[PDB]
């Protein structure tokens, strides 16, 4: 319906947000643990 697409857009959008900063913080810690 017309409300199902709006819910999917907003859930997808906040999913994109949390996936983005999860990957960003995780790879930040990855490049951080590189230590010599």
């Amino acid at each position: 319906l017309s409300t199902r697409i709006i819910g999917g857009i907003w859930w997808f959008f906040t999913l994109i947000i949390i996936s983005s900063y999860t990957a960003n913080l995780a790879a930040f810690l990855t490049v951080e643990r590189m230590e010599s």
Partner: peptide
């Protein structure tokens, strides 16, 4: 395509 597949199923299903 996979997301709107359920949408057109519900369009053809509901009607």
């Amino acid at each position: 395509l996979a997301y709107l597949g359920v949408s057109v199923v519900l369009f053809v299903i509901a009607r």
